[PDB]
Amino acid sequence: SGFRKMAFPSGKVEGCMVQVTCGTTTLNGLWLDDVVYCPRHVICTSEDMLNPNYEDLLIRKSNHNFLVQAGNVQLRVIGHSMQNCVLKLKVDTANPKTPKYKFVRIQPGQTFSVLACYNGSPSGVYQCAMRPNFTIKGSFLNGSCGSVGFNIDYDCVSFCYMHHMELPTGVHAGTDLEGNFYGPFVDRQTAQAAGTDTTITVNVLAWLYAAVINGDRWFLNRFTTTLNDFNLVAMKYNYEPLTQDHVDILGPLSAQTGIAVLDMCASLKELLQNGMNGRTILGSALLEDEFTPFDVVRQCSGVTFQ
Amino acid sequence: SGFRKMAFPSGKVEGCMVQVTCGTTTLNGLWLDDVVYCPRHVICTSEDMLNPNYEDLLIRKSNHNFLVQAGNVQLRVIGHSMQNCVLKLKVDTANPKTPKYKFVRIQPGQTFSVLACYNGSPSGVYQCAMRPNFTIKGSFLNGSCGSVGFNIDYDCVSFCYMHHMELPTGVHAGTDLEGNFYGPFVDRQTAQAAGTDTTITVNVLAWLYAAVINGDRWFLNRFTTTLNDFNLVAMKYNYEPLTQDHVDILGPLSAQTGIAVLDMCASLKELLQNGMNGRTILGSALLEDEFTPFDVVRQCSGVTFQ
Ligand SMILES: Cc1cc([C@@H](C)Nc2ccccc2C(=O)O)c2nc(N3CCOCC3)cc(=O)n2c1
Ligand SMILES: Cc1cc([C@@H](C)Nc2ccccc2C(=O)O)c2nc(N3CCOCC3)cc(=O)n2c1
Ligand SMILES: [Ca+2]
Ligand SMILES: [Ca+2]
Ligand SMILES: [Cl-]
Ligand SMILES: [Cl-]
Ligand SMILES: [Cl-]
Ligand SMILES: [Cl-]
């Protein structure tokens, strides 16, 4: 029993982390097969990050300008290319620690683990969610760019995030592994800010199911509601609208606990309208929205990985 | 920037996890050099866990009764011994993935990462603290026994916890890697319950320092206090007494931020007496006490590991 914000085991990703240096700048790269992936702004000086012309800055770079180090061993770069906002470096050796992997562009509300790295060395692992406004609330310092986010399905690592930028807000923005930013952000230090940070309703509901499975049930009530009635409340509190697709995804948790989804919605409605009155749920005094329904089923059943 | 509940990279430990089966029972073991460590109650049936005589139950076991599997490969057991509440199995092959490691018995209030495992397969990683009452608030299901907790210092893994028992309360108890339980708990399913769960004051203070370093400073006030005055408040709210040793450990964070430790104590005092008034600190509506001062300095500076 017990519920915790749980990250995937990071060993498979640790074996893919390398250090990439372009003249003055050092950040992290991801080494899979014979390609190293890193943020293209590695080719930039801090003087360039205001209005960089990435295509022009890359004309002055050759393969031998990209210094790639896997732990202690230097990799030989035999080609380079820009794909959207990521630089791909072809090396002459396939990473022997390459796991089975895929590249995935995740949807807002989905969760993933982040391996925070500096100078190609792993530092820590924690769980994140892609916010509805396409930011993540992470822990990233200077040098952490190129750290990746991922999910693990038994033996396969699905890479979904590469870290690029910290916004003035203190939240974080980045790309998928094809180099396309999540949301409207660009790899330029300009005036960009995050939109409304809406709460992921279906995740809060999943987490309430997780709470009931663990004995935290003081929030269950005698009420029910409808999708349209609940959504009037969700809107007022800057919650995402709940759809029938969300209800269906909660099906297994509804079946396991015998709590109708709309009954749980009426519990959430009361929590939003009245607060918690100084109580707690699964050790939290706030409503948690970075557990997906799959996350709750995963943890509450004990699924393992290669 | 940003602060997150961050676990150590788990790869070095993943390579040490194995499955141990004794007749009917399967749990996890830790394979370091040519020894496998696991909870001794692997030799028990569910009928034995009420009043087990571990010495008598072990008389009927031989080396070939202990089935040890590292992923897919079976290990040959050439000796077995009981040390306190842990069973040590000598195998004929040294784990080639053995990291540099040590065994450490941690103090209450110290934190560590847990690699939750089932059938010798890693499932997830999360950060824990040894509570003042010698329990941990973890995420453990049946089959998770033998999962370990650890800290990583650059290249060295310091193992500090092995999971054994879930108390009726829903909290968790276990041993160091010499098999000595933390606290008064025993590996018997009897009437045992946790004592008063006191809050780790020095950790809350460290986390308030972490908050200021990130722009959450609404809780700073115009007040100060004394150790004895603050401790009158700590006692009332079931906080651990703060000592000069605690003040000294907070020195580096006090120096970095220019906030006198006793000034921060007056901020915590006001928070305890008035609550948060519906505000939040580093994304929490509660006062967090599972970050040590070292944890805050670690994350806020970017220390990495082998
Ligand atoms: C041996 C090889 C291969 C490539 C290209 C064709 N292929 C890759 C380049 C980078 C990473 C992966 C690959 C790949 O083929 O999988 C490549 N692309 C280069 N570019 C610079 C000018 O603009 C176009 C890209 C330069 C170079 O020396 N290359 C060498
Ligand atoms: C080859 C070897 C070695 C040992 C002991 C001496 N050594 C270990 C036993 C278990 C794990 C590690 C070691 C070690 O020597 O490091 C050992 N201890 C056994 N015991 C059963 C009866 O009560 C005493 C223990 C049985 C056995 O076949 N052993 C075989
Ligand atoms: Ca295979
Ligand atoms: Ca060495
Ligand atoms: Cl892994
Ligand atoms: Cl490698
Ligand atoms: Cl590791
Ligand atoms: Cl191994």
XYZ file of C-alpha atoms and ligand atoms in Angstrom:
678
model
C 0.000 0.000 0.000
C 0.892 3.681 -0.085
C 1.020 6.048 -3.043
C 4.136 7.952 -4.108
C 5.216 10.180 -6.995
C 7.219 7.421 -8.673
C 9.662 7.695 -11.573
C 10.665 4.884 -13.891
C 13.994 3.149 -13.193
C 16.508 5.332 -15.000
C 19.312 2.861 -15.716
C 18.425 2.312 -19.366
C 18.565 6.068 -19.985
C 21.679 6.646 -17.868
C 23.583 4.495 -20.349
C 22.648 6.861 -23.187
C 23.704 10.172 -21.625
C 26.752 11.940 -23.059
C 28.367 15.379 -22.921
C 28.316 17.601 -26.009
C 30.612 20.618 -26.299
C 30.628 23.114 -29.168
C 33.464 25.541 -28.493
C 32.246 27.350 -25.455
C 28.971 25.629 -24.577
C 28.504 22.271 -22.878
C 25.204 20.457 -22.411
C 23.872 16.901 -22.511
C 23.215 14.629 -25.448
C 21.327 11.371 -25.929
C 23.308 8.556 -27.597
C 21.170 5.912 -29.317
C 22.648 3.606 -31.960
C 25.215 5.771 -33.828
C 23.438 9.128 -33.395
C 23.744 11.725 -30.628
C 20.787 14.073 -30.121
C 21.103 17.418 -28.347
C 19.581 20.909 -28.388
C 20.713 22.908 -31.392
C 21.438 25.928 -29.187
C 24.683 24.149 -28.231
C 26.104 26.016 -31.244
C 25.156 29.362 -29.675
C 27.059 31.745 -27.451
C 25.132 33.586 -24.754
C 25.538 36.596 -27.068
C 23.647 34.680 -29.778
C 20.605 33.545 -27.777
C 18.769 36.861 -28.314
C 18.248 36.570 -32.096
C 20.158 33.507 -33.314
C 20.210 32.550 -36.989
C 20.754 28.846 -36.398
C 21.271 28.072 -40.087
C 23.997 30.717 -40.406
C 25.687 29.758 -37.128
C 25.786 26.115 -38.265
C 27.552 26.979 -41.537
C 30.705 27.715 -39.517
C 30.688 24.301 -37.780
C 32.326 21.073 -38.953
C 32.108 17.549 -37.558
C 35.349 18.026 -35.606
C 33.883 21.075 -33.823
C 31.382 18.867 -31.938
C 33.155 17.262 -28.981
C 31.174 14.272 -27.693
C 32.267 12.413 -24.558
C 30.573 9.308 -23.152
C 31.763 9.262 -19.566
C 35.512 9.210 -20.170
C 35.630 7.999 -23.796
C 35.577 10.427 -26.726
C 33.291 9.663 -29.660
C 34.243 10.353 -33.277
C 31.740 12.580 -35.108
C 31.327 11.704 -38.789
C 28.294 13.827 -39.650
C 25.938 16.452 -38.308
C 22.477 17.685 -39.227
C 19.772 19.971 -37.869
C 16.204 18.661 -37.531
C 13.870 21.373 -36.206
C 15.406 22.453 -32.885
C 17.620 19.397 -32.318
C 21.100 18.681 -33.629
C 21.843 15.114 -34.708
C 25.488 14.027 -34.585
C 26.457 10.859 -36.442
C 29.213 8.997 -34.585
C 31.322 6.079 -35.769
C 30.331 3.755 -32.895
C 26.902 2.451 -31.932
C 26.109 2.857 -28.241
C 26.417 -0.704 -26.860
C 24.045 0.290 -24.038
C 21.328 1.378 -26.475
C 18.010 0.056 -25.110
C 15.010 -0.797 -27.220
C 13.452 2.615 -27.737
C 10.977 4.776 -29.607
C 10.407 8.503 -30.061
C 6.932 9.678 -29.005
C 5.267 13.099 -28.967
C 3.087 13.012 -25.856
C -0.217 14.795 -25.257
C -0.830 17.437 -22.574
C -1.807 15.759 -19.323
C 0.420 12.726 -19.888
C 3.239 12.055 -17.430
C 6.865 11.038 -17.836
C 10.107 10.678 -15.909
C 12.993 13.136 -16.263
C 16.647 12.186 -15.792
C 18.300 15.483 -14.880
C 21.909 15.545 -16.083
C 24.910 17.881 -16.065
C 28.025 17.451 -18.214
C 26.620 14.132 -19.389
C 26.402 12.784 -15.828
C 23.025 11.790 -14.333
C 22.059 13.759 -11.226
C 18.519 12.717 -10.297
C 15.199 11.379 -11.515
C 11.694 12.703 -10.911
C 8.216 12.498 -12.409
C 6.728 15.252 -14.561
C 3.546 15.981 -16.474
C 3.130 17.864 -19.742
C 0.971 20.753 -18.548
C -2.094 21.736 -20.613
C -0.142 24.899 -21.506
C 2.770 22.759 -22.803
C 5.208 23.613 -20.013
C 6.631 21.284 -17.386
C 7.362 22.088 -13.736
C 10.838 20.608 -13.459
C 14.155 21.036 -11.658
C 16.716 22.317 -14.161
C 19.844 24.412 -13.643
C 22.329 25.783 -16.155
C 23.943 22.882 -17.986
C 20.850 20.675 -17.719
C 19.760 21.276 -21.325
C 19.645 18.028 -23.246
C 18.291 16.105 -20.272
C 15.454 13.927 -21.507
C 12.052 12.721 -20.377
C 10.827 9.219 -21.039
C 8.379 6.419 -20.311
C 9.287 2.738 -19.960
C 6.994 -0.029 -21.258
C 8.514 -3.313 -20.033
C 11.652 -3.328 -22.196
C 11.076 -0.291 -24.445
C 12.021 3.296 -23.581
C 9.736 5.871 -25.223
C 11.610 9.180 -25.264
C 9.196 12.115 -25.283
C 11.051 15.208 -24.033
C 14.346 17.055 -24.374
C 14.924 20.072 -22.160
C 15.778 23.373 -23.822
C 14.626 26.498 -21.992
C 13.643 27.974 -18.644
C 10.971 30.662 -18.990
C 11.081 33.818 -16.842
C 8.153 32.249 -14.975
C 10.420 29.508 -13.643
C 8.731 26.744 -15.632
C 10.380 24.737 -18.390
C 9.939 24.170 -22.105
C 11.460 21.744 -24.552
C 10.978 19.527 -27.570
C 10.153 15.996 -28.575
C 13.099 14.003 -29.905
C 12.379 15.177 -33.457
C 13.151 18.679 -32.187
C 9.641 20.153 -32.308
C 8.841 22.237 -29.251
C 5.844 21.430 -27.126
C 3.601 24.476 -27.256
C 4.469 27.772 -28.959
C 7.942 28.225 -27.472
C 11.098 28.916 -29.468
C 14.771 28.444 -28.583
C 15.352 32.206 -28.351
C 15.639 34.281 -25.163
C 12.778 36.605 -26.094
C 9.494 37.654 -24.475
C 7.670 34.338 -24.164
C 5.456 33.358 -21.235
C 3.188 30.449 -20.379
C -0.566 30.572 -20.818
C -3.197 29.629 -18.269
C -2.018 26.649 -16.209
C -5.165 24.516 -16.146
C -5.557 21.500 -13.868
C -5.709 18.037 -15.444
C -9.151 16.932 -14.277
C -8.945 13.275 -15.305
C -5.662 12.938 -13.398
C -7.140 14.428 -10.223
C -9.973 11.905 -10.498
C -7.516 9.036 -10.979
C -5.624 10.216 -7.883
C -8.852 10.309 -5.874
C -9.402 6.691 -6.915
C -5.856 5.943 -5.744
C -6.720 7.565 -2.410
C -9.811 5.397 -1.884
C -7.802 2.257 -2.657
C -5.556 3.244 0.272
C -8.123 4.125 2.941
C -8.248 7.899 2.416
C -12.003 8.124 1.798
C -13.202 11.022 3.974
C -13.979 12.956 0.762
C -16.573 10.468 -0.518
C -20.068 11.933 -0.234
C -23.732 11.115 -0.819
C -23.904 13.075 -4.074
C -23.641 12.591 -7.818
C -23.581 14.937 -10.804
C -23.553 15.043 -14.609
C -20.778 15.761 -17.093
C -22.283 19.137 -18.003
C -23.001 20.077 -14.379
C -19.500 19.126 -13.241
C -17.930 20.995 -16.158
C -19.612 24.215 -15.034
C -17.604 23.781 -11.826
C -14.427 22.693 -13.622
C -14.491 25.856 -15.743
C -14.894 28.138 -12.725
C -11.818 26.549 -11.083
C -9.670 26.434 -14.244
C -9.966 22.657 -14.583
C -9.913 21.010 -17.993
C -13.359 19.979 -19.275
C -14.089 16.304 -18.643
C -15.157 14.277 -21.682
C -16.727 10.858 -22.139
C -13.293 9.670 -23.283
C -11.978 10.651 -19.846
C -14.858 8.811 -18.165
C -14.070 5.699 -20.206
C -10.364 5.801 -19.329
C -11.406 5.852 -15.662
C -13.506 2.736 -16.254
C -11.065 0.196 -14.820
C -10.601 2.292 -11.669
C -14.376 2.700 -11.362
C -14.841 -1.061 -11.731
C -12.079 -1.924 -9.260
C -13.468 0.361 -6.545
C -17.174 0.228 -7.366
C -17.312 4.041 -7.323
C -19.175 5.436 -10.324
C -17.092 7.999 -12.196
C -19.823 10.638 -11.882
C -20.087 9.937 -8.148
C -16.359 10.649 -7.851
C -16.931 13.805 -9.897
C -19.433 14.938 -7.258
C -16.753 14.354 -4.617
C -14.278 16.467 -6.588
C -16.950 19.133 -7.089
C -17.468 19.382 -3.329
C -13.704 19.524 -2.768
C -13.388 22.383 -5.249
C -16.297 24.324 -3.745
C -15.442 23.785 -0.064
C -11.707 23.120 0.014
C -10.151 20.491 2.254
C -10.840 22.202 5.618
C -7.295 21.482 6.726
C -7.496 17.770 5.901
C -5.122 15.838 3.627
C -5.389 13.204 0.886
C -2.506 10.780 0.282
C -0.247 13.135 2.205
C -1.257 16.176 0.146
C -3.205 19.290 1.120
C -3.786 20.074 -2.576
C -5.526 18.136 -5.350
C -2.795 16.325 -7.293
C -3.031 16.200 -11.086
C 0.255 14.609 -12.233
C -0.863 10.974 -11.906
C -2.558 9.561 -15.008
C -5.138 6.756 -14.762
C -2.479 4.384 -16.124
C -0.065 5.647 -13.462
C -2.532 4.764 -10.697
C -3.209 1.294 -12.117
C 0.529 0.763 -12.677
C 1.538 1.622 -9.115
C -1.496 -0.033 -7.517
C -0.722 -3.350 -9.283
C 3.084 -3.591 -9.371
C 4.040 -3.676 -13.045
C 7.795 -4.084 -13.548
C 10.254 -3.493 -16.383
C 13.249 -5.077 -18.106
C 15.404 26.645 -11.071
C 12.508 24.703 -9.588
C 12.504 22.229 -6.716
C 11.357 18.616 -7.026
C 11.313 15.488 -4.862
C 14.281 13.932 -6.654
C 15.612 10.381 -6.389
C 19.127 9.270 -7.224
C 19.678 7.636 -10.631
C 18.842 3.996 -9.995
C 20.901 2.246 -12.674
C 23.696 1.138 -10.356
C 21.156 -0.535 -8.061
C 19.055 -1.991 -10.885
C 22.063 -4.104 -11.833
C 22.097 -5.689 -8.366
C 18.445 -6.747 -8.117
C 17.642 -10.462 -8.249
C 14.717 -12.765 -7.473
C 14.925 -15.123 -4.494
C 12.521 -18.046 -4.129
C 12.372 -20.428 -1.168
C 9.766 -23.054 -2.003
C 6.604 -21.059 -1.983
C 7.742 -17.483 -1.370
C 9.335 -15.104 -3.855
C 10.805 -11.701 -3.045
C 13.766 -9.559 -4.081
C 17.427 -9.894 -3.241
C 20.454 -7.625 -3.555
C 23.461 -9.140 -5.370
C 26.810 -7.550 -4.495
C 30.084 -9.369 -5.170
C 29.295 -13.077 -4.543
C 26.616 -12.565 -1.864
C 22.846 -12.156 -2.214
C 21.030 -10.359 0.612
C 17.299 -10.739 1.221
C 14.783 -10.724 4.081
C 14.984 -13.881 6.155
C 11.192 -14.239 6.090
C 11.626 -15.653 2.566
C 11.904 -18.995 4.393
C 8.436 -18.508 5.907
C 4.999 -19.559 4.754
C 2.100 -17.209 5.426
C 1.166 -19.761 8.108
C 4.542 -19.135 9.782
C 4.502 -15.324 9.932
C 2.464 -15.277 13.172
C 5.103 -16.824 15.477
C 8.029 -17.960 13.318
C 11.054 -19.674 14.846
C 13.498 -18.564 12.169
C 16.339 -20.706 13.513
C 14.196 -23.857 13.426
C 12.716 -23.079 10.002
C 16.236 -22.578 8.612
C 17.415 -26.000 9.828
C 15.247 -27.590 7.121
C 16.812 -25.521 4.303
C 19.867 -26.367 2.200
C 21.751 -24.290 -0.359
C 19.817 -25.902 -3.223
C 16.502 -24.799 -1.668
C 17.308 -21.120 -2.369
C 16.518 -20.369 -6.013
C 18.246 -17.159 -7.124
C 17.615 -15.702 -10.582
C 19.327 -12.612 -12.001
C 17.001 -11.580 -14.793
C 17.014 -14.793 -16.816
C 20.198 -16.450 -15.495
C 20.149 -18.788 -12.493
C 22.814 -18.354 -9.824
C 24.431 -21.273 -8.001
C 24.115 -21.053 -4.202
C 27.132 -22.438 -2.338
C 26.349 -21.249 1.187
C 23.732 -19.557 3.316
C 23.723 -17.775 6.658
C 21.396 -15.694 8.812
C 22.584 -12.317 10.135
C 19.908 -10.680 12.307
C 16.838 -10.427 10.058
C 18.614 -10.836 6.706
C 19.611 -14.007 4.891
C 22.967 -13.999 3.109
C 23.340 -16.400 0.181
C 26.848 -17.119 -1.088
C 26.837 -17.639 -4.861
C 29.609 -18.959 -7.084
C 29.726 -15.877 -9.348
C 30.505 -12.271 -8.460
C 27.976 -9.794 -9.833
C 29.841 -8.120 -12.732
C 27.569 -5.081 -12.311
C 28.536 -4.650 -8.652
C 29.067 -0.909 -8.071
C 31.365 0.554 -5.472
C 29.211 0.365 -2.363
C 28.968 0.564 1.405
C 26.424 -0.460 4.032
C 25.229 2.418 6.235
C 22.735 2.609 9.102
C 21.098 6.009 8.654
C 19.699 8.309 11.338
C 16.046 9.371 11.633
C 15.427 12.435 9.498
C 17.889 11.397 6.789
C 16.574 10.762 3.280
C 17.225 8.066 0.701
C 15.955 6.714 -2.602
C 13.960 3.482 -2.871
C 14.010 1.217 -5.928
C 10.709 -0.650 -5.689
C 11.023 -4.117 -7.224
C 8.879 -7.197 -7.841
C 10.216 -10.632 -8.799
C 13.671 -9.092 -9.055
C 12.520 -6.557 -11.660
C 12.722 -2.806 -10.940
C 9.365 -1.022 -11.029
C 9.974 2.565 -9.911
C 12.126 4.916 -7.878
C 11.101 7.525 -5.320
C 12.568 9.476 -2.418
C 11.934 8.564 1.215
C 12.903 9.756 4.673
C 13.525 7.695 7.797
C 10.776 9.067 10.030
C 11.630 10.003 13.638
C 9.526 6.973 14.637
C 11.678 4.715 12.399
C 9.016 4.057 9.765
C 9.031 5.137 6.134
C 6.055 6.282 4.051
C 6.656 4.222 0.928
C 4.845 2.486 -1.925
C 5.137 -1.271 -1.412
C 2.855 -4.100 -2.520
C 3.091 -7.833 -1.908
C 6.305 -9.124 -3.448
C 8.182 -5.861 -2.865
C 10.080 -7.163 0.177
C 13.805 -7.050 -0.423
C 13.587 -3.763 -2.300
C 16.350 -1.520 -1.013
C 16.946 2.122 -0.185
C 20.203 3.859 -0.942
C 22.183 7.066 -1.342
C 24.719 7.758 -4.097
C 27.918 9.738 -3.432
C 29.535 10.298 -6.847
C 30.557 6.702 -7.588
C 29.667 4.938 -4.315
C 26.248 3.499 -3.452
C 25.522 3.538 0.292
C 22.782 0.981 0.937
C 20.779 1.880 4.039
C 17.405 0.106 3.850
C 15.831 -3.236 2.989
C 12.053 -3.474 3.010
C 10.439 -6.115 5.203
C 7.001 -5.256 6.576
C 3.877 -3.166 6.095
C 2.298 -2.164 9.409
C -1.497 -2.120 9.834
C -1.130 1.672 9.754
C -0.080 1.534 6.106
C 3.483 2.671 6.788
C 6.578 0.559 6.234
C 9.379 -0.923 8.301
C 12.620 -2.631 7.424
C 16.270 -3.164 8.231
C 19.720 -1.913 7.403
C 21.776 -4.262 5.242
C 23.157 -6.010 8.333
C 19.570 -7.067 9.028
C 18.881 -4.896 12.080
C 15.447 -3.305 11.978
C 15.071 0.431 12.208
C 13.033 1.101 15.326
C 11.447 -1.571 17.530
C 9.796 -3.607 14.771
C 10.165 -7.358 14.307
C 9.584 -9.570 11.263
C 6.462 -11.125 12.805
C 2.837 -10.304 11.947
C 1.925 -9.350 15.512
C 0.456 -6.274 17.210
C 3.028 -3.607 16.378
C 2.201 0.013 15.572
C 4.165 3.185 14.927
C 4.747 5.817 17.581
C 4.173 9.543 17.269
C 5.072 10.718 13.759
C 7.023 13.889 14.530
C 7.984 16.412 11.856
C 11.664 16.811 10.968
C 12.164 20.470 11.855
C 15.615 20.952 10.331
C 14.335 19.550 7.025
C 11.362 21.925 6.957
C 13.793 24.797 7.513
C 16.051 23.573 4.702
C 13.004 23.395 2.413
C 12.027 26.952 3.338
C 15.539 27.999 2.313
C 15.008 26.131 -0.963
C 11.767 28.072 -1.432
C 13.451 31.461 -0.976
C 16.150 30.514 -3.489
C 13.319 30.035 -6.009
C 11.249 33.180 -5.441
C 8.666 31.757 -3.026
C 9.280 34.258 -0.216
C 5.808 35.415 0.869
C 6.395 33.647 4.214
C 9.399 35.779 5.208
C 8.463 38.161 8.017
C 9.855 40.951 10.188
C 10.383 38.683 13.194
C 13.062 36.612 14.885
C 13.098 34.182 17.803
C 15.383 32.068 19.994
C 16.076 28.339 20.057
C 14.189 27.909 23.334
C 11.281 30.117 22.243
C 10.931 28.331 18.905
C 11.131 24.925 20.585
C 8.117 25.783 22.739
C 6.239 26.104 19.441
C 7.860 23.027 17.888
C 6.737 20.894 20.838
C 3.133 22.092 20.618
C 3.009 21.117 16.913
C 4.837 17.780 17.299
C 8.006 19.063 15.633
C 11.402 17.716 16.636
C 13.370 20.030 18.949
C 15.901 22.141 17.059
C 19.481 21.988 18.346
C 22.583 24.076 17.733
C 23.847 21.187 15.597
C 20.804 21.706 13.367
C 21.492 25.448 13.216
C 25.090 24.752 12.195
C 24.066 22.322 9.446
C 21.853 25.096 8.050
C 24.863 27.423 8.008
C 25.675 27.138 4.303
C 22.038 27.797 3.367
C 21.937 30.754 5.766
C 25.131 32.146 4.230
C 23.963 31.626 0.646
C 20.650 33.421 1.213
C 21.663 35.893 3.914
C 18.697 34.775 6.037
C 19.687 34.139 9.649
C 18.642 30.673 10.795
C 16.696 32.095 13.747
C 14.941 34.549 11.422
C 13.804 31.588 9.317
C 12.695 29.891 12.536
C 10.441 32.887 13.216
C 8.960 32.429 9.738
C 8.285 28.754 10.453
C 6.819 29.680 13.843
C 4.339 32.034 12.175
C 3.475 29.375 9.590
C 2.772 26.852 12.341
C 0.644 29.284 14.354
C -1.324 30.789 11.449
C -1.259 28.155 8.719
C -0.785 29.022 5.061
C -4.132 30.815 4.515
C -4.646 28.903 1.291
C -1.235 29.828 -0.125
C 1.424 27.391 -1.364
C 5.201 26.978 -1.073
C 7.145 25.211 -3.839
C 3.880 23.729 -5.060
C 2.915 22.403 -1.622
C 0.105 23.420 0.726
C 1.863 21.614 3.600
C 5.279 22.097 5.204
C 7.599 19.522 3.621
C 10.085 17.695 5.844
C 11.679 15.049 3.584
C 14.412 17.282 2.130
C 17.621 17.380 4.175
C 19.919 20.430 4.126
C 22.319 18.410 1.956
C 19.423 17.566 -0.369
C 18.649 21.262 -0.873
C 22.296 22.154 -1.525
C 22.654 19.129 -3.824
C 19.661 19.993 -6.001
C 20.273 23.749 -5.910
C 23.860 23.281 -7.188
C 23.693 20.362 -9.640
C 25.945 17.663 -8.205
C 26.170 14.614 -10.480
C 27.214 10.983 -10.091
C 29.193 8.249 -11.840
C 28.119 10.251 -42.864
C 27.340 11.562 -42.914
C 25.922 11.544 -42.983
C 25.251 12.772 -43.025
C 23.726 12.827 -43.098
C 23.266 12.557 -44.533
N 23.152 11.821 -42.215
C 23.099 12.023 -40.776
C 23.587 13.189 -40.206
C 23.530 13.372 -38.833
C 22.985 12.387 -38.026
C 22.497 11.223 -38.591
C 22.555 11.040 -39.964
C 22.011 9.752 -40.577
O 22.175 9.524 -41.805
O 21.396 8.923 -39.853
C 25.995 13.946 -42.991
N 25.254 15.273 -43.039
C 25.957 16.513 -43.007
N 25.172 17.733 -43.059
C 25.693 19.079 -43.034
C 25.061 19.993 -44.089
O 23.654 19.954 -44.080
C 23.176 18.638 -44.220
C 23.731 17.722 -43.130
C 27.406 16.508 -42.928
C 28.126 15.220 -42.886
O 29.314 15.199 -42.826
N 27.356 13.930 -42.922
C 28.019 12.784 -42.883
C 31.142 -21.680 1.177
C 30.240 -21.533 2.400
C 30.450 -20.466 3.313
C 29.597 -20.371 4.419
C 29.763 -19.247 5.440
C 30.916 -19.578 6.391
N 30.054 -17.995 4.754
C 29.007 -17.242 4.084
C 27.696 -17.694 4.088
C 26.705 -16.966 3.447
C 27.024 -15.785 2.797
C 28.331 -15.331 2.791
C 29.321 -16.059 3.433
C 30.760 -15.548 3.421
O 31.684 -16.264 3.889
O 31.017 -14.409 2.946
C 28.585 -21.313 4.571
N 27.667 -21.200 5.778
C 26.611 -22.133 5.991
N 25.783 -21.952 7.171
C 24.668 -22.783 7.560
C 24.686 -23.163 9.044
O 24.861 -22.055 9.895
C 26.020 -21.330 9.560
C 25.990 -20.871 8.102
C 26.410 -23.211 5.042
C 27.305 -23.324 3.874
O 27.155 -24.206 3.087
N 28.409 -22.325 3.675
C 29.201 -22.443 2.621
Ca 15.250 -8.509 -26.914
Ca 37.123 3.058 -9.965
Cl 16.045 1.488 -16.375
Cl 27.887 3.268 -23.508
Cl 22.727 4.869 -11.009
Cl 24.518 -8.746 -13.393
